[PDB]
Motif scaffolding. Structure first.
Motif, PDB file in Angstrom:
ATOM      1  N   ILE A   1      18.736 -61.455   2.087  1.00  0.00           N
ATOM      2  CA  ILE A   1      19.238 -60.150   2.845  1.00  0.00           C
ATOM      3  C   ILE A   1      19.449 -59.164   1.866  1.00  0.00           C
ATOM      4  O   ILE A   1      19.805 -59.520   0.767  1.00  0.00           O
TER       5      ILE A   1
ATOM      6  N   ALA B   1      10.901 -63.198  19.167  1.00  0.00           N
ATOM      7  CA  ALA B   1      12.151 -63.035  19.060  1.00  0.00           C
ATOM      8  C   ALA B   1      12.251 -61.306  18.953  1.00  0.00           C
ATOM      9  O   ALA B   1      13.167 -60.594  19.192  1.00  0.00           O
TER      10      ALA B   1
ATOM     11  N   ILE C   1      17.666 -58.792  13.337  1.00  0.00           N
ATOM     12  CA  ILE C   1      17.352 -60.388  12.740  1.00  0.00           C
ATOM     13  C   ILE C   1      16.273 -60.132  11.750  1.00  0.00           C
ATOM     14  O   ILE C   1      15.496 -61.128  11.134  1.00  0.00           O
TER      15      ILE C   1
ATOM     16  N   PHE D   1      25.128 -61.457  26.657  1.00  0.00           N
ATOM     17  CA  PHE D   1      24.074 -62.306  27.149  1.00  0.00           C
ATOM     18  C   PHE D   1      23.225 -61.420  28.339  1.00  0.00           C
ATOM     19  O   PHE D   1      23.568 -61.685  29.379  1.00  0.00           O
TER      20      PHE D   1
ATOM     21  N   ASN E   1      25.594 -57.481  19.517  1.00  0.00           N
ATOM     22  CA  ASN E   1      24.896 -58.862  19.423  1.00  0.00           C
ATOM     23  C   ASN E   1      24.457 -59.183  20.576  1.00  0.00           C
ATOM     24  O   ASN E   1      25.094 -59.365  21.739  1.00  0.00           O
TER      25      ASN E   1
ATOM     26  N   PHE F   1      22.569 -62.480  22.420  1.00  0.00           N
ATOM     27  CA  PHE F   1      22.084 -63.655  22.362  1.00  0.00           C
ATOM     28  C   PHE F   1      20.772 -63.892  22.359  1.00  0.00           C
ATOM     29  O   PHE F   1      19.888 -63.337  23.305  1.00  0.00           O
ATOM     30  N   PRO F   2      20.186 -64.842  21.619  1.00  0.00           N
ATOM     31  CA  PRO F   2      20.843 -65.500  20.660  1.00  0.00           C
ATOM     32  C   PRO F   2      20.657 -65.079  19.138  1.00  0.00           C
ATOM     33  O   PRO F   2      20.911 -65.719  18.261  1.00  0.00           O
TER      34      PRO F   2
ATOM     35  N   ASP G   1      32.336 -58.169  17.605  1.00  0.00           N
ATOM     36  CA  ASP G   1      31.789 -59.609  17.496  1.00  0.00           C
ATOM     37  C   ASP G   1      31.209 -60.275  18.814  1.00  0.00           C
ATOM     38  O   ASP G   1      30.420 -60.946  18.632  1.00  0.00           O
ATOM     39  N   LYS G   2      31.588 -59.462  19.880  1.00  0.00           N
ATOM     40  CA  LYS G   2      30.929 -59.845  21.218  1.00  0.00           C
ATOM     41  C   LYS G   2      29.657 -60.208  21.074  1.00  0.00           C
ATOM     42  O   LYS G   2      28.684 -59.401  20.685  1.00  0.00           O
ATOM     43  N   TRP G   3      29.254 -61.359  21.718  1.00  0.00           N
ATOM     44  CA  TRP G   3      27.952 -61.665  22.012  1.00  0.00           C
ATOM     45  C   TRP G   3      27.476 -61.416  23.230  1.00  0.00           C
ATOM     46  O   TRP G   3      28.013 -61.935  24.397  1.00  0.00           O
TER      47      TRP G   3
ATOM     48  N   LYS H   1      36.985 -55.393  16.283  1.00  0.00           N
ATOM     49  CA  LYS H   1      36.688 -56.822  16.619  1.00  0.00           C
ATOM     50  C   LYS H   1      35.906 -56.941  17.927  1.00  0.00           C
ATOM     51  O   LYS H   1      35.173 -57.819  17.914  1.00  0.00           O
ATOM     52  N   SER H   2      35.620 -55.820  18.395  1.00  0.00           N
ATOM     53  CA  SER H   2      34.719 -55.657  19.660  1.00  0.00           C
ATOM     54  C   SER H   2      33.374 -55.910  19.447  1.00  0.00           C
ATOM     55  O   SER H   2      32.369 -56.617  20.051  1.00  0.00           O
TER      56      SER H   2
ATOM     57  N   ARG I   1      20.006 -57.741   7.181  1.00  0.00           N
ATOM     58  CA  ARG I   1      19.919 -58.762   8.370  1.00  0.00           C
ATOM     59  C   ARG I   1      21.165 -59.402   8.668  1.00  0.00           C
ATOM     60  O   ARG I   1      21.990 -59.457   7.972  1.00  0.00           O
ATOM     61  N   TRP I   2      21.273 -59.460  10.001  1.00  0.00           N
ATOM     62  CA  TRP I   2      22.528 -60.024  10.454  1.00  0.00           C
ATOM     63  C   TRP I   2      23.858 -59.191  10.619  1.00  0.00           C
ATOM     64  O   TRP I   2      24.759 -59.688  10.598  1.00  0.00           O
TER      65      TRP I   2
ATOM     66  N   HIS J   1      22.056 -62.308  15.967  1.00  0.00           N
ATOM     67  CA  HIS J   1      23.268 -61.848  15.547  1.00  0.00           C
ATOM     68  C   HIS J   1      22.827 -60.548  14.704  1.00  0.00           C
ATOM     69  O   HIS J   1      22.312 -60.452  13.785  1.00  0.00           O
TER      70      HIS J   1
END
Ligand SMILES: [F-]
Ligand SMILES: [F-]
Ligand SMILES: [Mn+2]
Ligand SMILES: [Mn+2]
Ligand SMILES: [Mn+2]
Ligand SMILES: [Mn+2]
Ligand SMILES: [Mn+2]
Ligand SMILES: [Mn+2]
Ligand SMILES: [Mn+2]
Ligand SMILES: [Mn+2]
Ligand code: NA
Lengths: 284, 282
Positions: free
Chosen positions: A128, A184, A90, A281, A82, A84-85, A277-279, A274-275, A51-52, A87
């Motif tokens: 987890i 969700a 889930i 929407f 990712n 929103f909301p 990481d992007k959340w 690092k891309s 998870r996550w 991560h």
């Protein structure tokens, strides 16, 4: 006893996780029994994604013994973005061994061919999980996801070792103790590929979460599809490696396959761009 | 240039992260300028908690140079619990240095004393930050959180390096590009301590996120409060360590404080109790 054999570093193309039974590698696809306790409806879940997390790790169908490796797209390691909301995933995400979403027949409930993979499992427990983990779960319900136009059921399950397990008997209980999770879950699977440039997915039954008995029925049907597959009787096995080391009556049974697996060579996780990481929407 | 000096392993009681300027430790509370660019209102944000983590790391007011240390709870480490649908913190969490939520006076807008801490900042960019990081941000707005009955403003900001920084100029832009983030932020701070036995929190202005202009005024106020504090002119500094190495006109100026800090002794992250995995449905 089930353990894991890791080769390479996580988040790399060389990464592989084989499931071992008493120290010897077996097929994560064919050699792990679907049932831990058949009459009590307890199943063995093979965990692929904690998870996550984002790395889309999956039991690979085209490698001997079907180790878990990271999925790829256009030659690149695949990470689910990712949304929103949420991560990453889930739920602890995985599959039920010895099952198959038959791609060669249109499934009546969903009116679409299966996605050629073992049935998918969403484990909702508090802890987890870890990739390669074989945990015992009870089915609570199931959702009829049409993923990219293919029958892709999502079983709702919970680790029998979870503190709430005893209070979770059917699908309605999930809404009682995990309010909002099922909604969700519906949203997550509808939109998670949109960041990849793909359309929103759809669910049959208006996204309704069918109950435990309905879930057991689908699970069993996919188990039968697998029985035909492993017996070598599918009209088209799609190149799936059917090598197994515990089913002696099958055409592809092979004792030797186990010893041919390299020894563990676990390395520290490799960095992730690092891309990831992007959340995002987004929405349907 | 700002860097970090890590002592020990993350997730342990010994862990400390000092912020360094040109290799020398400076106070994370008092020595980092509030403004990176005053004319353009670009602020220096000290990051304590990376998005989606649980360890409640904070600039320590009572330790010299105010290193970032994990908050403690009954002899152990304090972790914020996961409250569905959120995973740990939903923003890069930190504060603006040289600011103080005055605990000695009641604040007009919230009608409550401050929480005694630098003003809080929520950085909404896409990249997950790191503890001890000093990033430059644009203020977009602010929320009047009453945390456990205390004035605890939450500044909404964006890293100037974020791909969307150019399009994010005022609070309305947050809903335009990050729909739902503000509502989730309101909910997060209302319920995040419930798993700990605390009451639900509340916000002034019905949880409205005030705009940049309003936010700048509050930030300026907390900065003025700190100016009073650091000058040794507060009626009660609450035992906060005011030692600094860059403010030579302050009573507590002491460059030797930098040299007193032990060298980095960074260790691999320590594991976190699996109970922190738990997802609470409040
Ligand atoms: F699948
Ligand atoms: F604070
Ligand atoms: Mn797939
Ligand atoms: Mn699958
Ligand atoms: Mn799918
Ligand atoms: Mn599938
Ligand atoms: Mn605090
Ligand atoms: Mn703070
Ligand atoms: Mn607070
Ligand atoms: Mn605060
Ligand atoms: Na699939």
């Amino acid at each position: 006893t089930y353990t894991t054999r890791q080769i390479g570093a996580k988040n790399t193309l060389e990464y592989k996780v084989y499931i071992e039974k008493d120290g010897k590698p077996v097929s994560a696809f064919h050699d792990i029994p679907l049932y831990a306790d058949k009459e009590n409806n307890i199943f063995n879940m093979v965990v692929e994604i904690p998870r996550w997390t984002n790395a889309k790790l999956e039991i690979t169908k085209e490698e001997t013994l079907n180790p878990i490796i990271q999925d790829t797209k256009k030659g690149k390691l695949r990470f689910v973005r990712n949304c929103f909301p949420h991560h990453g995933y889930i739920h602890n995400y995985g599959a039920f061994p010895q099952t198959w979403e038959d791609p060669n027949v249109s499934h009546p409930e969903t009116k679409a061919v299966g996605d050629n993979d073992p049935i998918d499992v969403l484990e909702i427990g508090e802890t987890i999980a870890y990739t390669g983990q074989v945990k015992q779960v009870k089915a609570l319900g199931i959702m009829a996801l049409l993923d990219e136009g293919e029958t892709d059921w999502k079983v709702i399950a919970i680790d029998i070792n979870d503190p709430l397990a005893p209070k979770l008997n059917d699908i309605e209980d999930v809404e009682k103790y995990f309010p909002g999770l099922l909604r969700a879950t519906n949203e997550w699977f509808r939109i998670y590929k949109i960041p990849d440039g793909k359309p929103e997915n759809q669910f049959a039954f208006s996204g309704e979460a069918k109950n435990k008995k309905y879930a057991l029925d689908i699970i069993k049907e996919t188990h039968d599809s697998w029985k035909q597959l492993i017996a070598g009787k599918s009209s088209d096995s799609k190149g799936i490696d059917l090598t197994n080391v515990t089913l002696p009556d099958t055409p592809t049974y092979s004792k030797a396959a186990s010893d041919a697996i390299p020894p563990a060579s676990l390395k520290a996780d490799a960095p992730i761009d690092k891309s990831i990481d992007k959340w995002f929407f987004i929405s349907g």
